[PDB]
């Protein structure tokens, strides 16, 4: 009856779940298991470029804590 639209709606819902889940897993994979750094403002970008400079491996996401200093 009416519930035969539910396979098509379910397949459409899976096909809409794929982009958001995909970009979340890609942001966690390309950034060391964390969110993607949002730089809307130039201060956030300056901190991100500082992280890229202080990581030593030319990657902003590799974080260095108190173990880097003595």
Contact residues toward another protein (CB under 8 A) are: 2, 4-5, 7-9, 11-13, 15-24, 26-27, 29-30, 35-36, 38-43, 45-46, 49-50, 53-54, 56
CB of 13 to ligand 3PE, least distance (A): 29
Closest CA to 61 of 32, 19, 22, 26: 32
Q: CA 52, CA 47: separation in Å to the nearest integer? A: 9
Which of the residues 15 through 44 are near ligand 3PE (CB under 6 A)? 39-40
How far is Cα 18 from Cα 27, in angstroms, rounded to an integer? 14
Nearer to another protein, 21 or 63 (CB): 21
Distance, in Å, from the CA atom of 35 to the CA atom of 41, rounded to the nearest integer, reads 17
| Interface ranges with ligand 3PE (CB under 6 A) | 39-40
């Amino acid at each position: 009856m009416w519930f035969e639209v539910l396979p098509g709606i379910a397949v459409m819902g899976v096909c809409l779940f794929i982009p958001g889940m995909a970009t979340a897993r890609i942001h966690r994979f390309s950034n060391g298991g964390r969110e993607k750094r949002v730089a809307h403002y130039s201060y956030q970008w300056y901190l991100m470029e500082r992280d890229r400079r202080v990581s030593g491996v030319n990657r902003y996401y590799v974080s260095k804590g108190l173990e880097n200093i003595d």
